[PDB]
Design a protein around this nucleic acid. Structure first.
Length: 65
DNA sequence: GTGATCAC
DNA sequence: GTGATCAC
């Protein structure tokens, strides 16, 4: 599935399969991605986040340490 | 300010 | 070792 986001301003969308790290900053979801390139970075509202990313956040919220 | 990061 | 980013 895809998440569309703001960083800079050229608009963006990314397959959740290409998302390295996910975490919560306040009521915002922040993540890093890419592979062929640099580590891309993005964030979206925690309300308007696609269930999949939230699944990934939940995954990251239980990781030990 | 908040996490985590990149990019300088 | 600090600013710039991101949604509030």
């Amino acid at each position: 599935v895809k998440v569309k986001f703001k960083y800079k301003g050229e608009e963006k969308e990314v397959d959740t399969s290409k998302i390295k790290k996910v975490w919560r900053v306040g009521k915002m979801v922040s993540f890093t991605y890419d592979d062929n390139g640099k580590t891309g970075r993005g964030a979206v509202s925690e309300k308007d986040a696609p269930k999949e990313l939230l699944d990934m956040l939940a995954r990251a919220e239980r990781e030990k340490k």
